[PDB]
RNA sequence: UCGAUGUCGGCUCGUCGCAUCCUGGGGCUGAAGAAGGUCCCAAGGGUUGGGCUGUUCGCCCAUUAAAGCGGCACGCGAGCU
RNA sequence: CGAAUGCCGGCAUGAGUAACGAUAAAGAGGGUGAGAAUCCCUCUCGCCGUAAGCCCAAGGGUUCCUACGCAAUGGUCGUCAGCGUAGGGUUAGGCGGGACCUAAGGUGAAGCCGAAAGGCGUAGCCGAAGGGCAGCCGGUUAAUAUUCCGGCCCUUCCCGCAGGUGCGAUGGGGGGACGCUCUAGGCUAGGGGGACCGGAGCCAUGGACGAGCCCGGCCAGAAGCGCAGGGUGGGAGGUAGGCAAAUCCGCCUCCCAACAAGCUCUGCGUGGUGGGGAAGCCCGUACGGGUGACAACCCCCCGAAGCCAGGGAGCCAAGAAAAGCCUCUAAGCACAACCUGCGGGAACCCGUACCGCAAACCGACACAGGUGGGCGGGUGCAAGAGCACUCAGGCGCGCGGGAGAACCCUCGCCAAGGAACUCUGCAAGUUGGCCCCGUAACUUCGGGAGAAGGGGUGCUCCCUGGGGUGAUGAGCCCCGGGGAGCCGCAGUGAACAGGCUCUGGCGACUGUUUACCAAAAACACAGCUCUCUGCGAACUCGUAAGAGGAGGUAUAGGGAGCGACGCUUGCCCGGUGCCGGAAGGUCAAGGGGAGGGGUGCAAGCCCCGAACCGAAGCCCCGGUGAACGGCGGCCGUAACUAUAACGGUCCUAAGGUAGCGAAAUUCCUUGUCGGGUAAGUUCCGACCUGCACGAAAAGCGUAACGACCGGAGCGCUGUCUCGGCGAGG
RNA sequence: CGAGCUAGCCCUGGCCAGGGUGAAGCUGGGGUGAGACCCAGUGGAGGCCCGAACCGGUGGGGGAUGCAAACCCCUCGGAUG
RNA sequence: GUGGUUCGUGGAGCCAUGGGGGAAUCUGGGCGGACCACCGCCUAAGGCUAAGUACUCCGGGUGACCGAUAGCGCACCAGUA
RNA sequence: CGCGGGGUGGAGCAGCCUGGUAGCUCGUCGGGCUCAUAACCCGAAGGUCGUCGGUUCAAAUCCGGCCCCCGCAACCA
RNA sequence: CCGAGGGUAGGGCCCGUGACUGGGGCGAAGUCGUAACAAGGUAGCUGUACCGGAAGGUGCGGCUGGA
RNA sequence: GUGGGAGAGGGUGGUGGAAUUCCCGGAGUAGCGGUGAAAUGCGCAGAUACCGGGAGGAACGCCGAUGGCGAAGGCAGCCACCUGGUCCACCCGUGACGCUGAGGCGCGAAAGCGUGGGGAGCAAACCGGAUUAGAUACCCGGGUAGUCCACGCCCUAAACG
């Protein structure tokens, strides 16, 4: 039947986006750590135009 | 009135509709004086505070005039009488001679063509509005104010009305659609007559949908749910509550009074 | 046997015991004959179809030579329901 | 280290076993090659065809095209590929999005709130398949095109001249601007017909050189006309409203209109001109090219859910906003400006390949699943997107070959009997579409009803009645009727298409629910009742501010139960709850200090502390059962027995009324009678000894409704006696 | 950290082939002092009916190291709310 | 009414405080564990102030530290696949 | 089988738990009123306290054993 | 073609019967009470409505066949 | 026809005073209610009795009669609007147009029912207190439907002269 991953570019940047994470105190920390851990990608790689 | 139906479908037998004869060939509302976008929504910021709402026909707000000392002395002619989805009372639209249009909740009687007005002057006739003092003790009246300049608030439901009782200082005793004798200030307007369309209390919704149309989702009894989400809940084949009847949140609901005790509004009240 | 021995009844398939329901042999009979009663030998073969109940079992209906009792994890779910 | 269902790696076993992913299906000849069932080609065969065919959107991100290639990837093979290496490929003022608008909602200056983080927040801004907006048809590439080229047609800005006018704002108004259902008129897309126009060709096998077969008879097109159709009154005075001002709008009062007459505004025909243009045949493709071609390019018919659109009628549940656009005036400015006609100039950013019901997306897979929108031809079956066959177009689903055992799956048929099967007719069968006869109890007059039960259905000829489009006619296309006759076992001859009834229980009903074992008698539901709530309402969320309630106001809103409707819902306020009681009793902090203590030489300083004054709450006094709940025991008595209308007595707060009753409640129980059966632990009707019914956790009934649950009969049958044969996987 | 699954609501678009049954309301007629009412014809109502799409998921069968960590075949519920 | 100190109401001071009451300027005020006398010690309700102390992203030295299942998760283009 | 409740004049109930004392309503008997019966009035009688044991000086009363009676439990499988 | 009749299917009326139940009639001397006739010891009768073992009681309006 | 008269004939709108019950204030004590007699009940939480204020519903004293009116059921403070019957006089008009009336149709006390409203007093059922052998009655204290209005049903009677 229908599954749980229904990709959607908008929803994805809108939710796990970078400006998205900067906006909140908890998300900014999410960035810190990922930066502090090394992670090549701080946030998901949404795309297209 | 109240239209009836032959049983050509169970439900549309007991079903009963209103009679919109009193509706002056109007229907399409009046831009300008209303309508405004009406933000429908069953909960506040986030959560749902009143339960069981949502869904139900889209609606446009008819921005009515609920404080008439706006036009003291300026007479206006009642133009139409139309339907208002936001209330039980039908409403009348009227053109002042000032050239301004505005709606008023329509009183029983008021016919299209009639002239109506407000102010200390104003003749005591259906439609006219005046400060409570200047109104004849005993006359009935609707659309009362509670405090000078704050707008109408009592007897505005379909065909409801309040009767003046006496005077007493800068105050005048009323008798609200509920039976409470209240002391209102003299300077509160109150347009004379009863609200009209009193057949409203007689409409037999009819089916399940009918309720759904007016935006009210099904209502489930506490008795149906479990202990986890309401007092009356569990365990075997139904049950008799098992304790003093209570609400989802738990306070008694078969008798417990609510008005907050030490309210300042107490002293101006006298009844039930 | 609880780091698991699936459990009532039915169904399919059986197989064994004798404390034998039938058929064969036999003694006593309050056994004239026919038909019985009871007991001894005998297990080779046989031991029906329905109505009711999840039923085991039973009670009925129509029969029959008879419509036997029990065991095999109250036989048989890596065979079925 | 030998164990920890230990951790990591490696390699065994089952095992050449199960599988190789829809039963839509393959065969052959010829190529290329080191090697072909599997790659290319041709012929035959099969499958889909409201798609298994085209066109968008989302998602994917090189998968597209071409040359060179098989290690691995492909469930086998592979010369092929969505794979490997390389190169090429996506072109926009007019399509989509942005230099436009607003929706929910986000954010947020002003302001409010919160220990901090942060929460709220009218202006504004962000925010979209909603509003706004100017490109249609052909041609080209190996791969892109409403983008490039051709034909034709438009939109903005900027700068000019020509000339009209008071111009002029983020401000005023108008407009934009709206639901559901059913619909008229005229059009188009789309499709059928043709003795007519245009064509390569074809006479097969017994007949046919014939109004013969087969193939095709269009597309776009500026203004104007023409045909539809939508919008819209025009004057003049008065003015106190539209938060400044208006000449605008609004509201009065007179005039001419009431018509679409006239202005505009769309649609659709015609239109200068531009383009396309079959079959067949010739070729070399992995495909396209050439010829047919000076191609013809016409006449009827059917006809939309689409177009004229802001069309019309009806109904209640009463159906976004803002900008563009029109108008109006304000500051300013009128050598500006703005409006209209002609020019030339300027016209940016992103997306464009390919997949796209799927092998390129979501499911770890080339996965029998999931995925929004538009087009979706013909014939027949009453209709249709249904069903069978089939255009275009695309497939034969990436292991094959043989064999013809048991058994399994899916399917077909069966003597005689037919439910005997079994927990249960589970399953499967019977039935089946349209037309016409014909239908009961009961009933809320609607229904029950497709009740039940029947007859008709094909083809041929004759006669004949209506329409529709054409002119009042031929044709073409729809609906009818009568009468003769023909062939089969059989005429909705294939495919799609109810078994029926009687009777109980439960729930009134259409609905809803345990995604992934429960769809119900459960939830909901109209309706009834109780109780709260006077509005800064009650209630809910929140520390708050704040919001929902509600821009509502007792005919309203929160809460509880019951659950259509009909007839009804008895008694108990003793305990519990809730409601009402400015009296009493107790009752905390606090007031009060009689009186006592500790130190000081002392004034003083510091402690305890009795009266008494002291709230809510409890106690107490009343009420309240559609509030929490409760609603008896033992004896005796009537002139046959029998039982008990009647009596005695004990206790209670009061001692279940009606109606129902072996029940969805009955333990003893297969109660005991009656009914259906040859037989009936179920079922139906009774009785009442109700273990352990009973009146809004409603009581008893109820027409209709049900993938609910029990009982019976009819029909029919592989369920069974009791199996047998055949088919494919 | 999550409502790209699922639940509800808010904003804005879309979809529901074709057939049935035939409510009111009108129109005429009848009826009466005026009515109620009764006829036909019209009309096209409905949590109305048959039935695709679509939304489900009733019963059985298959599947159960599956095609599938919910599937497939036959059957069946609703389908203008 | 609370917090801090060893101090959990304790005979509970001292030090901070949210609430109420509310002074004085050396003959003034706090403190020395209830409180009072004496004898003593400090001088509240403004602020600044190195060094001595903690740590190891980074550089260097040393190891009765590991030697590619050890040692950082990574000796190798790893916070990667 | 298990839990706890109960046997009192003719009937139905008290009486114990803090042992010495059996009380109430009805009924029965005698007498009255009435023509007579009932009602009403006046008086009177009746209880091995379920039984066998002992506990104490003394048992309806306290304690164990049986005889019936009533109510409650008989669950997980 | 019609057609006696036979078959199948569903109605209508009538008769007979049925566990059980409703009330009725009739039957010398069974039980419970006192409703009515005297002012019947609450004047009675009545239509309706509720309640009660039973006659019956009560509410509402009425009636002279009572005062 | 003309011209006049009486009347609780009917419907609608409004309105007035008495009295009852309740609320509020004043004032005031040891009992009020009730009956054959009592109790239940109410009352020192301030009753009964008295005064002042307010709310509300229902019925209209005296006039009042053995009276009037209507077809009957039935109809009563007062005011007005709409409206029916009827009698007298004048003998002017029509000119036999008449009577009764199966069915139909309409009205129809009280109780009752549906829907919504209202609710003082009263009052089935119902609960208490007395009475009696017993009282599911008669007496007393409480009290719900109903009694009231609007609309729609119901169609009865000692609807009796
Ligand atoms: N014929 C009387 C009708 O039935 C009833 O009357 C019946 C009963 O009331 C009556 O019963 C009476 C009883 O009232 C009276 N107090 C005692 C008497 N012994 C009884 O008598 C009855 O039984 C006996 C014996 O069996 C018979 O012989 C006698 O005929 C019979 N009436 O017996 C009557 C039947 O026979 C109605 N009360 C009466 O109004 C009605 O009209
Ligand atoms: Mg608007
Ligand atoms: Mg919130
Ligand atoms: Mg938020
Ligand atoms: Mg109602
Ligand atoms: Mg509910
Ligand atoms: Mg539950
Ligand atoms: Mg709880
Ligand atoms: Mg509960
Ligand atoms: Mg239960
Ligand atoms: Mg209980
Ligand atoms: Mg075990
Ligand atoms: Mg083991
Ligand atoms: Mg032997
Ligand atoms: Mg012998
Ligand atoms: Mg055996
Ligand atoms: Mg055993
Ligand atoms: Mg057994
Ligand atoms: Mg066994
Ligand atoms: Mg098994
Ligand atoms: Mg095994
Ligand atoms: Mg070891
Ligand atoms: Mg391993
Ligand atoms: Mg093997
Ligand atoms: Mg094998
Ligand atoms: Mg194999
Ligand atoms: Mg395959
Ligand atoms: Mg085909
Ligand atoms: Mg690639
Ligand atoms: Mg390719
Ligand atoms: Mg190649
Ligand atoms: Mg391979
Ligand atoms: Mg594979
Ligand atoms: Mg090769
Ligand atoms: Mg490649
Ligand atoms: Mg730019
Ligand atoms: Mg907004
Ligand atoms: Mg914010
Ligand atoms: Mg904006
Ligand atoms: Mg847009
Ligand atoms: Mg555009
Ligand atoms: Mg392409
Ligand atoms: Mg403007
Ligand atoms: Mg505007
Ligand atoms: Mg030939
Ligand atoms: Mg053209
Ligand atoms: Mg102005
Ligand atoms: Mg060509
Ligand atoms: Mg319109
Ligand atoms: Mg704007
Ligand atoms: Mg201007
Ligand atoms: Mg492109
Ligand atoms: Mg493309
Ligand atoms: Mg699609
Ligand atoms: Mg494949
Ligand atoms: Mg797939
Ligand atoms: Mg879909
Ligand atoms: Mg089509
Ligand atoms: Mg068809
Ligand atoms: Mg199909
Ligand atoms: Mg057969
Ligand atoms: Mg046969
Ligand atoms: Mg048969
Ligand atoms: Mg059987
Ligand atoms: Mg059997
Ligand atoms: Mg059955
Ligand atoms: Mg079946
Ligand atoms: Mg049934
Ligand atoms: Mg049923
Ligand atoms: Mg149901
Ligand atoms: Mg579901
Ligand atoms: Mg489930
Ligand atoms: Mg279902
Ligand atoms: Mg299910
Ligand atoms: Mg608010
Ligand atoms: Mg609001
Ligand atoms: Mg409520
Ligand atoms: Mg319920
Ligand atoms: Mg229920
Ligand atoms: Mg009750
Ligand atoms: Mg109580
Ligand atoms: Mg009680
Ligand atoms: Mg009480
Ligand atoms: Mg209280
Ligand atoms: Mg107190
Ligand atoms: Mg019984
Ligand atoms: Mg029998
Ligand atoms: Mg029987
Ligand atoms: Mg029971
Ligand atoms: Mg029950
Ligand atoms: Mg109840
Ligand atoms: Mg129920
Ligand atoms: Mg249903
Ligand atoms: Mg049977
Ligand atoms: Mg078989
Ligand atoms: Mg085979
Ligand atoms: Mg009609
Ligand atoms: Mg219809
Ligand atoms: Mg429907
Ligand atoms: Mg359907
Ligand atoms: Mg501390
Ligand atoms: Mg101090
Ligand atoms: Mg010190
Ligand atoms: Mg010091
Ligand atoms: Mg420092
Ligand atoms: Mg390592
Ligand atoms: Mg090594
Ligand atoms: Mg590692
Ligand atoms: Mg267990
Ligand atoms: Mg009979
Ligand atoms: Mg009888
Ligand atoms: Mg009497
Ligand atoms: Mg008497
Ligand atoms: Mg009497
Ligand atoms: Mg009576
Ligand atoms: Mg009584
Ligand atoms: Mg004369
Ligand atoms: Mg007559
Ligand atoms: Mg009447
Ligand atoms: Mg009445
Ligand atoms: Mg009274
Ligand atoms: Mg007596
Ligand atoms: Mg009384
Ligand atoms: Mg009379």
From Swiss-Prot, chain A:
One of its GO terms (molecular function) is structural constituent of ribosome. GO terms for biological process: translation. Keywords: Ribonucleoprotein, Ribosomal protein. The keyword Lyase does not apply. One of its GO terms (cellular component) is ribosome. It comes from the Bacteria. Residues 29-49 have a biased composition (Basic residues). The keyword Transmembrane helix does not apply. Residues 26-49 are annotated as: Disordered. Found on the solvent side of the large subunit. HAMAP family: Ribosomal_bL34. Belongs to the bacterial ribosomal protein bL34 family. Part of the 50S ribosomal subunit. PANTHER family: LARGE RIBOSOMAL SUBUNIT PROTEIN BL34M, MITOCHONDRIAL RIBOSOMAL PROTEIN 34 FAMILY MEMBER. The open reading frame (ORF) for this protein is entirely within the ORF for the RNase P protein (RnaP). The two start codons are separated by four nucleotides. This is Large ribosomal subunit protein bL34. It comes from Thermus thermophilus (strain ATCC 27634 / DSM 579 / HB8). The lineage of its organism: Bacteria, Thermotogati, Deinococcota, Deinococci, Thermales.
Curated annotation (Swiss-Prot), chain B:
SUPFAM superfamilies: Nucleic acid-binding proteins, Translation proteins SH3-like domain. One of its GO terms (cellular component) is large ribosomal subunit. Residues 256-272 have a biased composition (Basic residues). One of its GO terms (molecular function) is rRNA binding. The keyword Protein transport does not apply. Coiled coil: none annotated. The keyword Cell division does not apply. Residues 222-272 are annotated as: Disordered. NCBIfam families: rplB_bact. Belongs to the universal ribosomal protein uL2 family. Part of the 50S ribosomal subunit. Forms a bridge to the 30S subunit in the 70S ribosome, contacting the 16S rRNA. May also make transient contacts with protein S6 during translation in the 70S ribosome. One of the primary rRNA binding proteins. Required for association of the 30S and 50S subunits to form the 70S ribosome, for tRNA binding and peptide bond formation. It has been suggested to have peptidyltransferase activity; this is somewhat controversial. Makes several contacts with the 16S rRNA (forming bridge B7b) in the 70S ribosome. PANTHER family: LARGE RIBOSOMAL SUBUNIT PROTEIN UL2M, RIBOSOMAL PROTEIN L2. This is Large ribosomal subunit protein uL2. It comes from Thermus thermophilus (strain ATCC 27634 / DSM 579 / HB8).
């Amino acid at each position: 039947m229908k599954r749980t991953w229904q990709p959607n570019r908008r929803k994805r940047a809108k939710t796990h986006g970078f400006r998205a994470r900067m906006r909140t105190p908890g998300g900014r920390k999410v960035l810190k750590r990922r930066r502090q851990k090394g992670r090549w990608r701080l946030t998901p790689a949404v795309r297209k135009r | 009135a109240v239209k009836k139906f032959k049983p050509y479908t169970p439900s549309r037998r007991f079903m009963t509709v209103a009679d919109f004869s009193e509706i002056t060939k109007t229907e399409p509302e009046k831009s300008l004086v209303k309508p405004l976008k009406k933000t429908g929504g069953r909960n506040n910021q986030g959560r749902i505070t009143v339960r069981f709402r949502g869904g139900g026909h889209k609606r446009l707000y008819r921005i009515i005039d609920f404080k008439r000392w706006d036009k003291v002395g300026i007479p206006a002619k009642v133009a139409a009488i139309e339907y208002d989805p936001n209330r039980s009372a039908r409403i009348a639209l009227l053109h002042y001679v000032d050239g301004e249009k505005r709606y008023i909740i329509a009183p029983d009687g008021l016919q299209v063509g009639q002239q109506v007005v407000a102010g200390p002057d104003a003749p005591i006739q259906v439609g006219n509005a005046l400060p409570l003092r200047f109104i004849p003790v005993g006359t009935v009246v609707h659309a009362v104010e509670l405090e000078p300049k704050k707008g109408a608030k009592l007897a505005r439901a379909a065909g409801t009305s309040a009767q003046i009782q006496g005077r007493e200082g800068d105050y005048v005793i009323l008798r609200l659609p509920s039976g409470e004798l209240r002391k209102v200030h003299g300077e509160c307007y109150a347009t004379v007559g009863a609200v009209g369309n009193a057949d409203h209390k007689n409409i037999v919704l009819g089916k399940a949908g009918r309720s759904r149309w007016l935006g009210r989702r099904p209502h489930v009894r506490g008795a149906a749910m479990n202990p986890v989400d309401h007092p009356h809940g569990g365990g075997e084949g139904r049950a008799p509550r098992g304790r003093p009847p209570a609400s989802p949140w738990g306070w008694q609901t078969k008798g417990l009074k609510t008005r907050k005790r030490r309210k300042p509004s107490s002293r101006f009240i006298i009844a039930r």
